[PDB]
Amino acid sequence: LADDGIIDNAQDNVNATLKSLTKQYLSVSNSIDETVARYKAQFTQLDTMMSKL
Amino acid sequence: TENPLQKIDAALAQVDTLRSDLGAVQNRFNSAITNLGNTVNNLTSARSRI
């Protein structure tokens, strides 16, 4: 139950790992946002050029 | 066959080495799993980005 215990170090390592994975999730989320922004801008461009034609 | 104490010592050593092998295999497939997961997520991120 103390800090030196296997369970406490286990849960400390678990929270550290999930925080690193949360940083990775933030990276993937911003990449997703940028890619979606690009695709939606091109989709609006397609809509405008189809409206002209 | 006398001297059972050394045989008990051998049995407990066998238990300890089975524990060690179990942990070795555990971390072995943990490394394999994290490597394949990294490969999968890298592939999907590269595919979506480009």
Which residue of chain B comes nearest to A21, CA vs CA? Answer: B38
Contact by Cβ (8 Å): B48, A35:
yes
In angstroms, what is the resolution?
3.3
Contact A31, B49 (CB under 8 A): yes
Report whether A43 contacts A37 (CB < 8 A).
no
Pairwise CA distance, residues B7 & B11, whole Å: 6
CA A34/CA A21 separation, integer angstroms: 20
Q: Which residues of B touch A31 (CB under 8 A)?
A: 45, 48-49
The residue among A35, A36, A39 with the most chain B CBs within 10 A of its CB, best to mutate, is: A35
The answer to whether the beta carbons of residues A35 and B46 sit under 8 Å apart is no
B49 interface with A at CB cutoff 8 Å: yes
